[PDB]
Design an enzyme around this catalytic site. Structure first.
Site, PDB file in Angstrom:
ATOM      1  N   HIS A  54     101.622  39.540 -39.961  1.00  0.00           N
ATOM      2  CA  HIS A  54     102.232  40.722 -39.373  1.00  0.00           C
ATOM      3  C   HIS A  54     102.172  40.695 -37.850  1.00  0.00           C
ATOM      4  O   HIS A  54     102.832  41.500 -37.204  1.00  0.00           O
ATOM      5  CB  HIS A  54     101.471  41.963 -39.823  1.00  0.00           C
ATOM      6  CG  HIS A  54     101.671  42.297 -41.280  1.00  0.00           C
ATOM      7  ND1 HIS A  54     101.058  43.400 -41.839  1.00  0.00           N
ATOM      8  CD2 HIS A  54     102.413  41.723 -42.260  1.00  0.00           C
ATOM      9  CE1 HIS A  54     101.385  43.448 -43.119  1.00  0.00           C
ATOM     10  NE2 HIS A  54     102.220  42.462 -43.410  1.00  0.00           N
ATOM     11  N   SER A 113      97.297  49.516 -40.723  1.00  0.00           N
ATOM     12  CA  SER A 113      97.992  50.816 -40.553  1.00  0.00           C
ATOM     13  C   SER A 113      97.865  51.413 -39.170  1.00  0.00           C
ATOM     14  O   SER A 113      97.095  50.992 -38.305  1.00  0.00           O
ATOM     15  CB  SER A 113      97.371  51.844 -41.510  1.00  0.00           C
ATOM     16  OG  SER A 113      96.224  52.544 -41.027  1.00  0.00           O
ATOM     17  N   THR A 166     100.196  49.344 -46.847  1.00  0.00           N
ATOM     18  CA  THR A 166     100.023  49.183 -48.307  1.00  0.00           C
ATOM     19  C   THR A 166      99.109  47.990 -48.654  1.00  0.00           C
ATOM     20  O   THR A 166      98.297  48.071 -49.548  1.00  0.00           O
ATOM     21  CB  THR A 166     101.375  49.129 -49.009  1.00  0.00           C
ATOM     22  OG1 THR A 166     102.155  50.302 -48.705  1.00  0.00           O
ATOM     23  CG2 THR A 166     101.193  49.014 -50.539  1.00  0.00           C
ATOM     24  N   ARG A 185     100.398  43.852 -30.876  1.00  0.00           N
ATOM     25  CA  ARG A 185     101.219  43.508 -32.023  1.00  0.00           C
ATOM     26  C   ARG A 185     102.362  42.610 -31.578  1.00  0.00           C
ATOM     27  O   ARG A 185     103.521  42.984 -31.509  1.00  0.00           O
ATOM     28  CB  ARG A 185     101.646  44.748 -32.801  1.00  0.00           C
ATOM     29  CG  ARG A 185     102.308  44.494 -34.143  1.00  0.00           C
ATOM     30  CD  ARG A 185     103.055  45.744 -34.631  1.00  0.00           C
ATOM     31  NE  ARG A 185     103.395  45.559 -36.027  1.00  0.00           N
ATOM     32  CZ  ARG A 185     102.548  45.812 -37.045  1.00  0.00           C
ATOM     33  NH1 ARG A 185     101.328  46.316 -36.877  1.00  0.00           N
ATOM     34  NH2 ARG A 185     102.972  45.612 -38.273  1.00  0.00           N
ATOM     35  N   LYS A 235      95.170  52.481 -36.413  1.00  0.00           N
ATOM     36  CA  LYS A 235      94.938  51.837 -35.112  1.00  0.00           C
ATOM     37  C   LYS A 235      95.315  52.754 -33.978  1.00  0.00           C
ATOM     38  O   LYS A 235      94.536  52.932 -33.015  1.00  0.00           O
ATOM     39  CB  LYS A 235      95.718  50.536 -35.028  1.00  0.00           C
ATOM     40  CG  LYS A 235      95.059  49.419 -35.801  1.00  0.00           C
ATOM     41  CD  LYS A 235      95.740  48.046 -35.761  1.00  0.00           C
ATOM     42  CE  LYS A 235      97.103  47.951 -36.420  1.00  0.00           C
ATOM     43  NZ  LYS A 235      97.125  48.179 -37.935  1.00  0.00           N
ATOM     44  N   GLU A 276     110.788  54.786 -46.535  1.00  0.00           N
ATOM     45  CA  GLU A 276     110.978  53.372 -46.806  1.00  0.00           C
ATOM     46  C   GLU A 276     111.328  53.174 -48.271  1.00  0.00           C
ATOM     47  O   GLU A 276     111.923  52.143 -48.598  1.00  0.00           O
ATOM     48  CB  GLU A 276     109.692  52.664 -46.380  1.00  0.00           C
ATOM     49  CG  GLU A 276     109.689  51.165 -46.599  1.00  0.00           C
ATOM     50  CD  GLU A 276     108.256  50.673 -46.717  1.00  0.00           C
ATOM     51  OE1 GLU A 276     107.336  51.361 -46.211  1.00  0.00           O
ATOM     52  OE2 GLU A 276     108.064  49.604 -47.339  1.00  0.00           O
ATOM     53  N   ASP A 318     101.156  53.848 -45.374  1.00  0.00           N
ATOM     54  CA  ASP A 318     101.319  52.991 -44.199  1.00  0.00           C
ATOM     55  C   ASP A 318     100.199  51.956 -44.248  1.00  0.00           C
ATOM     56  O   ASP A 318      99.028  52.333 -44.236  1.00  0.00           O
ATOM     57  CB  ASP A 318     101.179  53.932 -42.991  1.00  0.00           C
ATOM     58  CG  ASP A 318     101.489  53.254 -41.666  1.00  0.00           C
ATOM     59  OD1 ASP A 318     102.701  53.256 -41.312  1.00  0.00           O
ATOM     60  OD2 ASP A 318     100.542  52.730 -41.005  1.00  0.00           O
TER      61      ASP A 318
END
Ligand SMILES: Nc1ncnc2c1ncn2[C@@H]1O[C@H](COP(=O)(O)O)[C@@H](O)[C@H]1O
Ligand code: NA
Length: 353
Positions: free
Chosen positions: A239, A262, A145, A279, A265, A70, A143
């Protein structure tokens, strides 16, 4: 994929220690260690240091390999880069006392990781765009942050994709204490957490990061009634669609939820400590990033779980480039009847906006 798994595991291991060790300093000097990206998301010295270690290990072992990372080093000042380098070298001084792996190289003559220009070069190798054919690595160096910066959960994730399918995944969870999630912790977990890993067709396993030699097989559990299950959801309201996730819970009579940042999970799912990772998307324009899900994909699969989007109930496609084309993500323990009930409920909730 023997050499690849070893490289991945050692790369994540070292980066897991660095990020655990600097979490507090980063937080405390959160004026000088942290950058805001074009979407206003944060990136720290830790993210770049992790990315440097990982890519330098990959490239030392596999010189021509492509990486989707990334981060990029354009714009990073020399002072910033010098700080990345210093953290790598401080980490090495602690790491080499206890954790060196025999006959394993993190650096070599071609990629010696000694100068600021080396750092920049290595960071900039993360610019592959992915896609449908061939082999490439997918990395999220830190992952979660925001979890990192909150002093809470985060992970260090690496995966290998070949022909659009994730073949290998490795997730370091440096702050993950199992006793907080009703499970026992293994010997050595306290220094830098756990490493989870899997290779397609060969099973999912974990080990304390400090060990990383003795591996324990993991598998999702299978509860029969949804009223007994536990959801996994992020912490950040932005998110995922928390209110819609609550509607799902209420429809399924679920009254137990765990929130953490992150891909840790996916690790709790795969260990059997929770049942459904939700999600849902807030905005349908968002395209999920592969590096937020690729390591977890293969870990969940090899653990016996199911992983789809959040609306259509189709398998995620890791060959579309840097993003997933589908909307949202749902993972569960399965079986298919549980999974499909969940995803169909999500679909219906979204459609009813
Ligand atoms: N609007 C968004 N929707 C879904 N994921 C996002 C969004 N914005 C950022 N992210 C991702 O959220 C990831 C962290 O996920 P988590 O810790 O599970 O909340 C980051 O690495 C981002 O790529
Ligand atoms: Na990241």
């Amino acid at each position: 994929l023997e050499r690849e798994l070893l490289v991945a595991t050692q790369a994540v291991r070292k980066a897991s220690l660095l990020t655990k060790r600097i979490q507090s300093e980063v937080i405390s000097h959160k004026d000088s260690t942290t950058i805001t990206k074009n979407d206003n998301s944060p990136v720290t010295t830790g993210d770049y240091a992790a990315q440097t270690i990982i890519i330098n290990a990959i490239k030392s072992n596999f010189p021509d390999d492509k990486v989707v990372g990334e981060e990029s080093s354009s714009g990073l000042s020399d002072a910033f880069v010098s700080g990345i380098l210093n953290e790598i070298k401080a980490n090495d001084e602690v790491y080499n006392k206890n954790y060196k792996k025999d006959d394993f190289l993190f650096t070599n003559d071609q990629f010696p990781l000694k100068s600021l220009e080396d750092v920049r070069q290595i960071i900039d190798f993360g610019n592959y765009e992915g896609g449908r054919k061939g082999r490439f690595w997918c990395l999220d160096p830190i992952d979660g942050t925001k979890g990192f910066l909150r002093g809470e959960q985060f992970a260090v994730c690496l995966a290998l994709i070949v022909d659009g399918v994730v073949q290998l995944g490795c997730i370091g969870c440096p702050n993950l204490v199992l006793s907080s999630y009703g499970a026992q912790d293994l010997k050595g977990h306290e220094s830098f957490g756990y490493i989870f890993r899997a290779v397609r067709g060969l099973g999912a396993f974990y080990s304390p990061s400090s060990d990383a030699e003795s591996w324990t097989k993991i598998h999702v559990r299978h509860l029969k009634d949804t009223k007994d299950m536990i959801t996994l959801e992020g912490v950040e309201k932005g998110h995922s669609s928390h209110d819609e996730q609550t509607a799902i819970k209420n429809k399924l009579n679920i009254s137990k939820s765990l929130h953490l940042d992150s891909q840790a999970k996916y690790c709790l799912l795969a260990l059997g400590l929770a049942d459904v990772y939700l999600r849902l998307p807030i905005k349908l324009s968002y395209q999920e990033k592969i590096w937020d899900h690729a390591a977890g994909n293969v870990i969940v699969h090899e653990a016996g779980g199911i992983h789809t989007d959040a609306m259509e109930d189709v398998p995620l496609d890791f060959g579309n480039g840097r993003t997933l084309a589908t909307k949202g993500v749902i993972a569960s323990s399965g079986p298919r009847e549980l999974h499909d009930l969940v995803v169909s409920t999500s679909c219906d909730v979204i459609q009813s906006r």
